[PDB]
Design a protein around this nucleic acid. Sequence first.
RNA 1: GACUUGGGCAAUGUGACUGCUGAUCAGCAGUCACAUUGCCCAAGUCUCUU
RNA 2: GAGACUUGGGCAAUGUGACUGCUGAUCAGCAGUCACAUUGCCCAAGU
Lengths: 98, 98, 103, 98, 50, 50, 98, 147
Amino acid sequence: ELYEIKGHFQDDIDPFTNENGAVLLPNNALAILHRYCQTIPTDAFGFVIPWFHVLQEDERDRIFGVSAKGKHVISINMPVNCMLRDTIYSDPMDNVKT
Amino acid sequence: RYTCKCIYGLLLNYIQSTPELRNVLTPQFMVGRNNISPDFESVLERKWQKSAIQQFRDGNANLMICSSVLEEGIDVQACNHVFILDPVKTFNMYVQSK
Amino acid sequence: EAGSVDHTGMRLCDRHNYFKNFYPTLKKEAIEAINSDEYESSKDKAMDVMSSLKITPKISEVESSSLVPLLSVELNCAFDVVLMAKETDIYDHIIDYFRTMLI
Amino acid sequence: LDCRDLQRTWEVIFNLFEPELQEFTRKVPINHIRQLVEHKHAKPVFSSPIVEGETVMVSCQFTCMEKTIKVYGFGSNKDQAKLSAAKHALQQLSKCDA
Amino acid sequence: KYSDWNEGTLTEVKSKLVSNRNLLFCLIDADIPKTLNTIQFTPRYTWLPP
Amino acid sequence: VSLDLMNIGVQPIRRSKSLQCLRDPSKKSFVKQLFNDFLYQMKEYGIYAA
Amino acid sequence: GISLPHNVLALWRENPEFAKIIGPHNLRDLALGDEESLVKGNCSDINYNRFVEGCRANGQSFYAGADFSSEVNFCVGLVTIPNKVIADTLEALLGVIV
Amino acid sequence: KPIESGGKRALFMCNTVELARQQAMAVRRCTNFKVGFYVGEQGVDDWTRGMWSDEIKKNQVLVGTAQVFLDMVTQTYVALSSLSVVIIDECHHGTGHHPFREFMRLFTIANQTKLPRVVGLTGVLIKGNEITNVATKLKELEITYRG
RNA sequence: GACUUGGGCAAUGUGACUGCUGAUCAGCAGUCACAUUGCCCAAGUCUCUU
RNA sequence: GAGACUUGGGCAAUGUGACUGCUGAUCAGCAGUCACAUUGCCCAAGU
């Protein structure tokens, strides 16, 4: 049935689709990011990977308010050659993997 | 994976030593990709191109060493014997191996 | 490189027989020395055994985070061989290596 | 970008470049094997490269103004060995042309 | 112009800009190459009097 | 125990799946993996297998 | 009668965050001369600057992310004792008094 | 009929490369169709968009490992409506974030009326050693695969 | 005094589900080096040309 | 003009070789959460 299928699937992190029908899936986000990072190094020496980091409770408070209490957040630092230098943070998830 | 190569070499030596198994048996081995070199001589090049599965199906090799790859749905000639050398771990592994 | 040159002429499946296939002249006196217990110290025993086989030493200090220096030894013989440990153990390590190989 | 004065940047560049500017104006550097060919008196006779392992050797015999000196170039590529042998022959010819 | 581009794309588009064909195609509709002095001047065999 | 003190040059930092436990650089881990697999072979199948 | 140089001891005790990154290798570099060791009692100014810069690089080179306290603790008089031993010494004191 | 005129193709997913190759050979011998073959061993990434298009215009049946087809569909070289059926060999692996279950998740994103027929194949229904309470496992599987 | 219902407090367990670590295996991607023979341009030295 | 020879800018591929990175599943250990079963105790009622 539609009800059981929707309840079984559409309860985890939502997927994303762009204006051209392309679909981005949460499980493939890490693979996409690592693949993109492998293309950017201009030389065989300058290979660099994203820097994942987990924020501490004082940082969690200072950034998210009380809403982040008891939930993990992951900060990711993009390599210098890329456009990003804003250290994107994740929403407070029940576990560090999520 | 390395167990496949090791037992393949041991079986080669044991078959070649015995007078009975010398002619009847012909071992061959497989693992997944990242295919380990099937030789022990550390030679820079190997000219062989025929796949192990073809040698097995065609009757060239009648004693196949395999690891968690030949277990799932692999159609073959009528195999009179199957040996599970390591203890079975999972229900589906037992079912498909049988 | 001063090393890494393989001219022993033995197959890699049997290159370990290099020390076994020397002339008995070096081997008998070397094993007599390595079996001798009166030696003043492990370092002295190692040096005397190594000189017995006419094999020249080469000891260098490998960089390390350990306070006790981490020293490597190269034998410079045709057989590419290198051993390394703490300098308190490198000599006894050489003792063990040549005890195992020389038969 | 800091000074925003072309004259200042020119002064810095000249201070960095003066020895090489003086040396190269007196003697213009050119491609080494092209230089050796343009030195037709040497008549560099390069033999065909041969490869052992992953390293390639190019042997050359050239008239070093009194003798057919033989030199060997070693490199990871045939052109690399060609260039090495050419440069070594050039330096030997320069030393003889004292 | 493209301040935030990766350097590889910047040098590729530079090579395209400084490419011979681009300079050509600029000069054709610049209407200049009609007047270039390129022939080895020989009046007896490769020129017409006014 | 000797190799843990090798002091190879700067290497990429390796951590566990959830990123709290540290791991040895890829080369040291690879050598250790090979030796551990050989030890497993020797323990399980015999001396000739080793 | 032997101690560390007084200047480096003052640096070690007054700068705990810089203290935590000091490694034994940096002490091996301080091959002080006869004058420094015997008469002056501490390393020269140039040696002091070399040490501080070497340790600053130490905090960022391969040595970063490691803990050197297990080897340099004895220099400043620090030692690590298990909790079991600390309990047992008190309890044995009660024993000896009884 | 061509894709631009609404042409449809048939997928035949698999979990291992050798199994995919054997099933491709079986389909090739048992049918007259010119079946494709797509695995990561030889490399398919260079089979770019335009030549994805001429490949799907060339082949009727695509037999290959799960991840290649998953990457194809997520990047939307081919629409789900451009498929008539989707056959998944060894469907008992479709749990968690495995590419089979990921593909079936991707199904719900597209229009429900355009979804192809899904035919899972298996000789076993239980994945792990949780062989007790088989009914919950069957309901989970029959929710994953839409049948 | 049977009968019925309900609730609460206990202990003794079971069935699973996640989280972390390690190991095993399958599954994808980005590369790089480099022998081999080809093709189109740029500039060179020489025979010839002259 | 005919040409040989070299460095280039490349365009191609037929090889072949090695490197690096990630996903997923399984097992083991540990930690924690859901429900459920068993032996009791006590209470609330109605007749």
